Ligand binder design. Structure first.
Ligand SMILES: [Mg+2]
Lengths: 146, 319, 322, 331, 152
């Protein structure tokens, strides 16, 4: 339960750094990502993980595939920040830090939203807790870097 | 030769000589086990088994001979001519000045333990240094206890105490039995009390001579003697004893050592402390240049109280 | 001879260690070398001695007759019996059998030694929250190896991502176990859990402290040494306690601290090494090791004890199998 | 074989308002979670939380001479009867809130000043969940419990049995999609129950459990249930206790701007009302004594009369109507 | 290991919304209408009731609101985009209340296969209340996927 925290922190630092790198001169994008990262756990708490992912989906389709998302191809800061947070959260649940690391995800590459629709209630609960935990780490680095 | 293996159930206390009475001086710090403590544990078992003939009740020594002891995880204290330099412990060989053997200045000694294999290479003169990670320290475990009132469940006045235990995996003891049937009696026991605070160690016994006692070092003038257990007696008498037992005179010798080992103990027969004796500490090395070539023995017993496990020296060579 | 004491916690346990290095104000006792939770031999002995002493004074000790300690004291110490009994009432000494088994009270320490050596209570099964089956009884190879060594002398390979677990912990078809918030993949294994249960049955009997040992088998999870150590160090209860200044109705100055607890549903074991009773002129029914062992078993088997601190806030209660 | 105690009393606790027995702030979406047993995830109230509540109430009652022993209990008089000479100085300590009144210190232990004098006579156990309220498609809500809870209740009865030396005082298996439930919960013509977001198949135990509840808390249930009792599997029950608690957003409003102030938005967890918990209260011989309370039985009697049918407040947020429970103390 | 109804709701919602997008990929009007009607539906239910909502859809198809089984309704047999969408929405909603996400799923409906509107006009108020809440819950998920997938 300690090594998993380090893995989360490593991922969180990486994705926030990518945000700050690509949009260094764009404070609006950085600020939007930060706000959404803070609001995200709340949306999950009050609506569940499934609905939250669906809510992100509406901010972007043919199929539910986080891989196919391209955050940089959007017009405004709101959609760019949403697409990034959505992909980050989905990537973590599906891939972790890669298959060369301790944590390689929970869903084995499957999109978390479709995963929720197919697997058991237990599978959904662990995905919910894990989602809250990674967002909690993203919030830390967001406040300190963005 | 019989090999006894003690496996501590949990912790061990080999208390230093200092007052440790409830309601007064209340701090017990463990030292590295002295061989007489191990001898005492064995003698007490025989004392209760009814073999009071081999015990030596009220006597300094028992009938049997404790060759010596060693702790294990088998490890030995760093020879005192091994000096830490940066991240390495370096072996320092004797020099000569004004026709006298000396140890050249190369830094201060730092305490620690090495495996039996590292010691074997040292004794063969093939050891140059040891990486600091292969030098072991003995783990201590500090416990703080109290005494509660019988009814009120609160601490009685002044009844708090501290013990610094050792966390040791194994203690080995080697015994030469002149027919007392120690191997059979030890086999009948699973455990015994060893050291203080009524701690016990499991007992295994095997009829075997450890390989370190069977080494072939060859013949040379330049022998050394690593003391694996404390050695009691004047250096002059020990060197003279060595000359007699190997039938060879000595041109010069150098004792590389440290703080003398203070040895007293507790006399269970008379229910009072034993008299204080002083010993050459384990890890000390006696470098010897014999007048003629000698066959360096794998081990040799020297000094006083041999039967209590003292004076176990391991043979070696130097250049 | 020796008696193995199995200890099963039914409420959280705080065996206090002042010397333990921790960020917690009041941490529990732990082994130096392994970092495992432990109950010191001296803590356990104090608990055992206090219970035994109360029973003796209340004439509830059985040796298969009622032990009358004052009667036995007189037929043992003879002319010195009356002054001894006076010391017992004055709480300067303990009753006869108590001192035979555990040694004299400190005032009479030098007279003779205690017959028993009370060993540390070592951890065996540590409860960890499981997504399936509520919680798992978690252990490790190093623990099993220690148990086997202690039992054999008194008479497994896992990666950090693997677990050998019973069926009730395993997600259907996924071959996974979820302990708290981490996922371990199930390593196929045939007899290791079964072997462990057999060892437990050989030491504590068919009933596992009020339940069939076969039920426990389905909820045992064996994890790697590093993972087990992690759980025993970071999954223990860390509880904030306060003191309220009722004058103001707010937390008093210096009235906040943190205390660690070993959880309930923890299994530990202590080997009680029993030597010959050392007091002079012993009564016949307790004059040797086997007789001391027998009294120990009857007195503490299926008993309830309180170990450690925080008794009055409901902590430290364990079931005993001897 | 539990000879350190002589008698025991079960303290039934029924919440009539939401309860926040707190564990402190966390860096999490739920800023202020309630107390939980970590390895089961079950909500609890630690014995030290409950003891502090019981002590404070008992103390105030003794100071106001409302304590009934056997007639009224005059603690100052009994103090003079016990401490005799140095009784006056002790009473002065009490009025200065340095020490607590006599019976309070006998039962619960001395105030922090006299901690080393003696221990408390009673052991206040952690409160554990017995019935947890869960919304139902039919019947509004259900009193939900599980085999592992029923088992822990039986084991606690074994504790009481061992303590009171009463051997006379001393099987539920369910699939995850199954339930044993009262008629009020069962959907019209389906043999199914919907609790929260889970469909459960009705299985053909409740009557016996109620009879047990009738033993501890009397013929009446806290002045009020079998029709809405639902027994579910251990893991389903566990998920309910962890994810069906009240989670509430609270704010601090700037009194001038009418808007949320900085550092004025947090989420707080509450154990729902209509939750049944219980704590085992063990009583041992007093370790401090007047004849009225010199043994275990007399102390038990005082505890029973003092707290049975009483109302207590446990946990924080008392000022916003949280933590109110009704107590039933039976032997 | 069981599943929660929410999982079945999301699953069913994705399936029926994908079914429309598949059968009418070139028809943005049909997709746009369905999304509008899915969005409108919960509000009608809250104000006028579930029964009136189901009947409201059928009246758009000019079907007798008293003599129609949901299974008999085939959305692929209508001309205008409006009636196609209404038929789909009525079909999806009725199927959910009648069959859930399948007989072996974690939710197999509430009406036990009986036509929901006929069920409403035959059962008690409490039965209708339970179905009404469930209707709102499945429509919430239909709206979610319609908003993200269906185009205008
Ligand atoms: Mg001692």
């Amino acid at each position: 339960i300690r090594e998993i925290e380090q893995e989360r922190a490593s991922f969180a630092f990486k994705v926030v750094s990518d945000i700050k790198d690509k949009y260094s001169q764009n404070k609006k994008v950085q600020g939007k990502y930060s706000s959404y990262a803070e609001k995200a756990p709340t949306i999950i708490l009050n609506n569940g993980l499934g609905a939250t992912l669906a809510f992100f989906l509406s901010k972007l389709i043919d199929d539910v595939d986080y891989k196919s998302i391209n955050p940089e191809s959007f017009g405004n800061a709101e959609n760019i920040a949403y697409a990034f947070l959505y992909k980050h959260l989905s990537t973590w649940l599906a891939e972790g830090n890669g298959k060369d690391s301790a944590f390689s995800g929970l869903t084995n590459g499957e999109d978390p939203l479709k995963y929720i629709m197919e697997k058991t209630a237990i599978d959904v609960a662990i995905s919910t807790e894990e989602a809250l935990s990674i967002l909690n780490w993203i919030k830390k680095f967001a406040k300190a870097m963005l | 030769m019989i090999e006894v293996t003690f496996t501590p159930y949990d912790v061990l206390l080999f208390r230093e000589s200092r007052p440790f009475d409830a309601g007064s001086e209340s701090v017990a710090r463990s030292i590295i086990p002295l061989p007489q403590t191990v001898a005492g544990a064995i003698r007490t078992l025989l004392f209760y088994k009814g073999l009071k003939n081999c015990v030596g009740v009220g006597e300094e020594e028992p009938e049997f001979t404790l060759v010596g002891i060693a702790i294990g995880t088998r490890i030995y204290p760093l020879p005192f001519n091994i000096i830490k330099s940066e991240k390495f412990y370096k072996v320092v060989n004797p020099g000569r000045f004004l026709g006298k053997l000396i140890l050249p200045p190369k830094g201060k000694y730092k305490s620690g333990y090495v495996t039996e294999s590292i010691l074997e290479k040292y004794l063969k003169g093939e050891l140059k240094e040891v990486e600091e990670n292969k030098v072991i320290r003995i783990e201590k475990e500090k416990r703080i206890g109290i005494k509660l009132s019988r009814e009120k469940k609160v601490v009685e006045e002044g009844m708090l105490y501290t013990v610094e235990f050792l966390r040791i995996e194994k203690i080995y003891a080697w015994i030469e039995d002149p027919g007392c049937g120690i191997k059979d009696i030890l086999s009948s026991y699973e455990f015994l009390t060893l050291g203080g605070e009524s701690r016990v160690a499991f007992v295994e016994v095997d009829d075997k001579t450890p390989d370190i006692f069977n080494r072939e070092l060859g013949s040379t003038k330049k022998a050394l003697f690593y003391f694996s257990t404390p050695t009691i007696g004047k250096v002059g008498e020990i060197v003279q004893e060595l000359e007699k037992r190997l039938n060879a005179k000595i041109d010069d010798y150098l004792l590389v050592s440290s703080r003398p080992t203070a040895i007293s103990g507790w006399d269970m027969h008379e229910k009072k402390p034993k008299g204080t004796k002083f010993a050459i500490p384990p890890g000390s090395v006696l470098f010897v240049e014999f007048k003629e070539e000698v066959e360096v023995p794998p081990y040799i017993k020297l000094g006083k109280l041999k039967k209590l496990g003292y004076g176990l020296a391991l043979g070696g060579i130097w250049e | 001879k020796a008696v193995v004491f199995g200890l099963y916690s039914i409420t959280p346990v705080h065996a206090g260690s002042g010397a333990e290095l921790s960020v917690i104000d009041l941490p529990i006792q732990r082994e130096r070398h392994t970092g495992f939770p432990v109950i010191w031999g001296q803590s356990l002995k104090g608990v055992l001695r206090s219970r035994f002493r109360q029973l003796e004074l209340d004439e509830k000790i059985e040796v298969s007759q009622k032990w009358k300690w004052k009667e036995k004291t007189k037929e043992v110490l003879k002319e010195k019996a009356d002054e001894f009994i006076k010391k017992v009432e004055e709480r300067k000494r303990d009753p006869l059998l108590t001192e035979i088994v555990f040694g004299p009270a400190t005032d009479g320490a030098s007279e003779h030694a205690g017959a028993v050596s009370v060993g540390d209570a070592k951890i065996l099964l540590f409860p960890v929250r499981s997504a399936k089956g509520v919680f798992a009884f978690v252990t490790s190879p190093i623990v099993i190896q220690r148990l086997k060594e202690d039992f054999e002398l008194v008479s497994v390979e896992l990666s950090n991502n693997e677990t050998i677990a019973g069926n009730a912990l395993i997600l259907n078809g996924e071959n996974k176990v979820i302990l708290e918030d981490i996922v371990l993949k199930v390593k196929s294994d045939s007899n290791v859990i079964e072997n462990l249960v057999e060892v437990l049955k050989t030491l504590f009997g068919d009933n596992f402290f009020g339940k069939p040992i076969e039920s426990i088998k389905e909820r045992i999870a064996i994890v790697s040494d590093d993972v087990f150590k992690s759980f025993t160090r970071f999954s223990t209860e860390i509880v904030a306690r306060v003191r309220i200044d009722a004058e103001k109705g707010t937390v008093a100055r210096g009235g906040l601290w943190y205390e660690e607890f070993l959880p309930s549903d923890t299994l530990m074991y202590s080997l009680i090494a029993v030597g010959s009773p050392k007091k002079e002129n012993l009564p016949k029914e307790v004059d040797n090791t086997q007789k001391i062992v027998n009294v120990l078993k009857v007195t503490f088997n299926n008993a309830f004890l309180q170990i450690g601190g925080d008794e009055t806030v409901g902590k430290g209660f364990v079931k005993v199998r001897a």
